[PDB]
Amino acid sequence: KPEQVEQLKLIMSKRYDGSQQALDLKGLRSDPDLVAQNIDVVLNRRSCMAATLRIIEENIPELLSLNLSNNRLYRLDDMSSIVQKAPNLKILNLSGNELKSERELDKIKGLKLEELWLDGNSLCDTFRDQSTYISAIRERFPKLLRLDGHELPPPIAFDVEAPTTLPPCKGSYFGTENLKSLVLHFLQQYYAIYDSGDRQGLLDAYHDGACCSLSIPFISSLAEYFKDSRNVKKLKDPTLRFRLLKHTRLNVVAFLNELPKTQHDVNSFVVDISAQTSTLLCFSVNGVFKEVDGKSRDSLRAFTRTFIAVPASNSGLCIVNDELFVRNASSEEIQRAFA
Amino acid sequence: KPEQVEQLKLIMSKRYDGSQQALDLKGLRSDPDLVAQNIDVVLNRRSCMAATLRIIEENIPELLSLNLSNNRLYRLDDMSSIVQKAPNLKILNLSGNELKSERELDKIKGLKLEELWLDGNSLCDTFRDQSTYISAIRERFPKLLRLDGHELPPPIAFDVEAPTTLPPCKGSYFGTENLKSLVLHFLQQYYAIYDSGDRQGLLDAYHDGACCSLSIPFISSLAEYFKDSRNVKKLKDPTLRFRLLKHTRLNVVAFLNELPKTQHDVNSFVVDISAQTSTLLCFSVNGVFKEVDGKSRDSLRAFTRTFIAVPASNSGLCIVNDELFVRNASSEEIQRAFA
Amino acid sequence: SFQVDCFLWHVRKQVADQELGDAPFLDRLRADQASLKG
Amino acid sequence: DSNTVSSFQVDCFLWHVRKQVADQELGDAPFLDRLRADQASLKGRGSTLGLNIETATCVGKQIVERILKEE
Amino acid sequence: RYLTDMTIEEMSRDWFMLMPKQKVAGPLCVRMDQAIMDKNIILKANFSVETLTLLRAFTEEGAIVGEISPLPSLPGHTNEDVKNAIGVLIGGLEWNDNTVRVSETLQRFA
Amino acid sequence: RYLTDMTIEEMSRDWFMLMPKQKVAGPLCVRMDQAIMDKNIILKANFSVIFDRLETLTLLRAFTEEGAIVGEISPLPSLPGHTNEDVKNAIGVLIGGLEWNDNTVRVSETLQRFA
Amino acid sequence: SVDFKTYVDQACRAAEEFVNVYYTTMDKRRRLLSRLYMGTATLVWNGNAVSGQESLSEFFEMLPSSEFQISVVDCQPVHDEATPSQTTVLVVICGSVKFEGNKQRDFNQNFILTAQASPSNTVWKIASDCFRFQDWAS
Amino acid sequence: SVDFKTYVDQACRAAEEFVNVYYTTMDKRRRLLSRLYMGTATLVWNGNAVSGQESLSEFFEMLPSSEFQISVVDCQPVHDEATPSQTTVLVVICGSVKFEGNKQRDFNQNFILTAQASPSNTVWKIASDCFRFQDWAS
């Protein structure tokens, strides 16, 4: 009855603690305000529960602590609608009720709670030991901190410290600005000759006995390099391995002019200087070039060339070993064509 | 005839190099040292070769180089006995000879060769490539350095640097002579009470809340300990886990009086102080004891006991946790009875 | 013809620098140098 | 003293190399001049010294090599 | 009369510069490497005694370390600037704690 | 191939014994004089060689600077053979027996190459 | 405000987790084992002593590869007086191990484990470890 | 006094052994990879540079676990002029790798390997290493 309902807000503020943001309902039926006016309010049927929901949704949906001890709560089929109204709740007490199943806890298991009390409920006899009970509650709430006034020990937690951060991918490395100027000038000159079409001028950059070889990935659009790809993991014949290698500057530069004419984006070269000693200098070059002849004259290639250089007089460097890896360009490699 | 050998010594001395201890028999038929004497020397017959071997066997078995090139050497079935006569011989030349089969090579694989010549012999044609031939030469001599005047690169050798040495097993660790005297002293007191027969005197060494438990390995002589052997690997029941644990100083020393009376060899105790803090001291003790009551008073046991002790007023230490591992002693543990 | 002069003179000079031989033999070596010059 | 004996022995070894050239009948004109002059002077020297040419013409072979081994 | 301390086989080899340093101390191009630390440095050189040709320094493995070379693009090479530059190089190397062996030919002429 | 340190005129000279001492140390008869005090002794000898090691012996003799014969080594007709190690034994015998009497002893340049 | 039967059952339910982590990790990922020891951890291995995170990593690089088969395990929660306000458990393990190119041996080992607290997450770390072979003298 | 085709066949007969060692060892025994580099070795890994046995071991401890499947290999004998009296070989490798919790990526890498002579056993060590992703910038 609504006249009876009217007094409920009074009795709720009567048991509302503003100092601790706690609501006390320990044994609400035997509070002689229910005996007055001849109105009793039972906490099992939904009418009273929904009235309280309306009250709280209008007054204080940010409460942190709540005490519902000893209130004959048989089932919580009707309290599942508390999660959306007061999600700030941290402390909950459900002691001394008639909660038949711990599965009833699955009916409000969407909260983020800090403290719970479940003693007095008969359900505690349904577990062999205390660990089965605590783990069955962990199945519904791991957010809790203290249960039955007992501070729960933090669970098993072994951080192996397995590292998964990959270092920063930096760009061109030369070391000294002097080696930078050196290898960059060499790249510019060499690849200027290389894109002219008459590559015969490379003979003054290569050694009499400068080796050279070509490689590509395994599967065409890149057919013209296929016939000279050298991959020793896949190729077993040793004498064929020897004849598939190019040895003298004559044979090297001839084979190099046999390759389709190119245009390299040298302004977009990426150079890695691996080792520098007094007697040799190895460095790898990652870049792009476009072909201009054949059927695939619009197809664009990406390359990773490796150079080993013995010193040459007047700050020059003579290639002794040369390995050209050629692939087709990535999508964004195509996008970042030339600057 | 032996005088044939006498005259052979002359031309052997003419062809002996004293700077390099080398003997040349290259193409003995040409360059008329043989022609200026009308004697042919066939290195296929066993008598002639054995005589030539004997000359050096008497004169200079410390030869460094030997040349047997171009001497119609079909088979060496009788020269395999050369390794023992001149063992300092390191360089051997068998070029342009008639070495037909590699089957001969297994008969002389006892030399210490550094340079060998086997070109011109037809057997070298029996391999498709050079790697099979070179590995077949490694099959007989890996000591070699240069073959047929060609410098062979040292072979493939990747030492993973895999460590397999176990560090030196030292004995008792105390660190400070203060902790040494202390923990030895405490072990002495506790194990003196322990062998008195009325172990109840341990109540003042244990904590009011000091736990205790017992363990033995899995396979008997250790039957009387089964009732209190505790292995969480074998035992899953949690209430049985609690009941097999000894909790209060009272229950601990009661359970400790349940075990058969003992006599420990403390002069042979092994002490490990794991952690010393301001609030605790953990240490394990490894030793032996003989029982003196019951049926197994002739059976000897070995143990690894772990103690954790908090400091106590008047320089004492209170046991808080006690774990006793008991096994029967190994044979060598029995032998090293007392010091 | 001229060479045995060269080799023998080398031999005598390196006998002399080891400080070996008579003074007349060094004098005759000096005469050898003066003659080989012409 | 020993310098005199050693120098005479090396002189006679040089002359023995010369006479071996004469054993191959290469009549080297200035060198044959040196040969016959050395003969006429060294026979008299050895006659005054008291050690025969047959000693020096074979002792010099090692006196020469003592210097070559020292490089 | 001239000197020869280094083989023309090893005298013709070129080199790289790890820490390149160049100085003009008169008609002189003086070139140094600073990157060599705690390694034996042997000083060998061929010269006449008046004019200059070339200065080189080796390691134990056979690597060239320091050089001094005159220029025709600059005036005539007087000896004293070179003599000062020599000490300059040895000092620059004892900076890097390189133990430095000096052959005995050099002190006779500069 | 052979050596010549002694002239056949000097190869044939026989000599007297002051303090005669003869010993057989291997296949060799060694003859020495002990009365000689502090006098230079030169060892000259003729023999044959094989692999830079003495094949056989012809004669070993010791002179002064004045030319007096001191010691001899001779192979034996009762024992013809003599390997170089026996020769080395005779060599050491001579070095000792002569430095006993403090006689300075010169060694010609042929012999030391082989012992 | 703290239960004991729960403390013991947590020690048990924890020790087997630690075992299944530590020995598997020494067999498989040796590079990472040292990070289980807290900075002030101590270890006595056959009488030789290791102290310090960095020197722990060094020593674990120096150890040969391993093959563990564990025989028996026991655990005890350690009284609040040994490590105040620290949840700590002692674990003892007897087992066998086969090393790289070394003869297989039986061993006893004991760890002490404390949980470190962070407002983000508490984690477990070793404070003491004692390892010794049963035939260590031979 | 030295053959050339033999230099090439040793280079090939060497590269597959080195690959089968290096990548299996990084996948399986990461703690041990660092000793394959000689003391003065240098490494450029995606532009970042490592110099020294010690810091190489450090870098490989810090690297995530890996799973390499190698696509293509090429090798070249290196002229006696780059390293006098040193047998030296260059290798280039295209492949893929899946890191710990990181997307699998394609890569190019190239080593230079010299054999150094020790009277116990002549052994092979890397002197330079260059590694880069094909999509490293992204």
Coordinates of C-alpha atoms in Angstrom, one line a residue, chain A residues 30 67 92 123 137 141 181 195 198 200 214 229 276 278 290 300 325 335:
Chain A
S30 CA 11.8 -6.6 13.7
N67 CA 24.8 -3.9 4.7
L92 CA 28.2 -5.9 0.2
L123 CA 25.2 -23.1 1.2
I137 CA 33.1 -17.8 -5.5
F141 CA 33.8 -12.6 -8.3
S181 CA 79.9 10.6 -47.3
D195 CA 71.2 3.1 -64.9
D198 CA 75.9 0.8 -71.0
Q200 CA 80.6 -1.3 -69.0
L214 CA 72.0 -13.0 -57.9
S229 CA 68.9 -17.0 -59.4
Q276 CA 84.6 -1.7 -41.4
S278 CA 91.4 -1.3 -42.5
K290 CA 62.1 0.4 -62.0
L300 CA 58.6 -2.2 -60.1
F325 CA 68.8 -9.8 -54.1
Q335 CA 53.2 4.3 -52.8

